[PDB]
């Protein structure tokens, strides 16, 4: 159920080579809160910005949720070559997302010979393990 303490979800960004603004995935519910993948072009040299967002649309300023997660960019040719980084963060209204502005080089992810991009699509994945939130379901 949505109360699950962990989950793995993916989001495929299309027309990736042409990305110019931040894109958000639909929500995946964990601990009954909406978690989303956020991707955007950055420049450390261009790089892929990859963040995990939590409960960002809520007007509440009383909530908080500590979570650990594995942010991964899927390599469709070989799963063992997927690029991953781990995070640990206390999510709350003032810091509702966390990740890396320079997750990996843009030139690498968009290289047709590396295996991360196909038909200009790149798939992002997040495995999140969150603790029970505070200031939500009193």
């Amino acid at each position: 159920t949505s109360w699950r303490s962990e989950a793995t979800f993916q989001f495929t960004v299309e027309r990736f080579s042409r990305l110019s603004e931040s894109v958000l995935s639909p929500p995946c519910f964990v601990r009954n809160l909406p978690w989303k993948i956020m991707v955007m072009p950055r420049f450390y040299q261009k790089s892929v910005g990859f963040f995990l967002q939590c409960n960002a649309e809520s007007d509440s300023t009383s909530w908080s949720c500590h979570a650990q997660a594995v942010l991964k960019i899927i390599n469709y040719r070989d799963d063992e070559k997927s690029f991953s980084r781990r995070i640990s963060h206390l999510f709350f209204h003032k810091e509702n997302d966390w990740g890396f502005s320079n997750f990996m080089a843009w030139s690498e992810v968009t290289d047709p010979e590396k295996g991360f991009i196909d038909d200009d699509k790149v798939t992002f994945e997040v495995f999140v393990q969150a603790d029970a939130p505070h200031g939500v379901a009193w």
């Binding site: 956020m38 980084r85 810091e95 997302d97 966390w98 990740g99 890396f100 502005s101």
Partner: peptide
């Protein structure tokens, strides 16, 4: 290299 918010 280092994590942060998207801000």
């Amino acid at each position: 290299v280092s994590p942060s918010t998207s801000y």
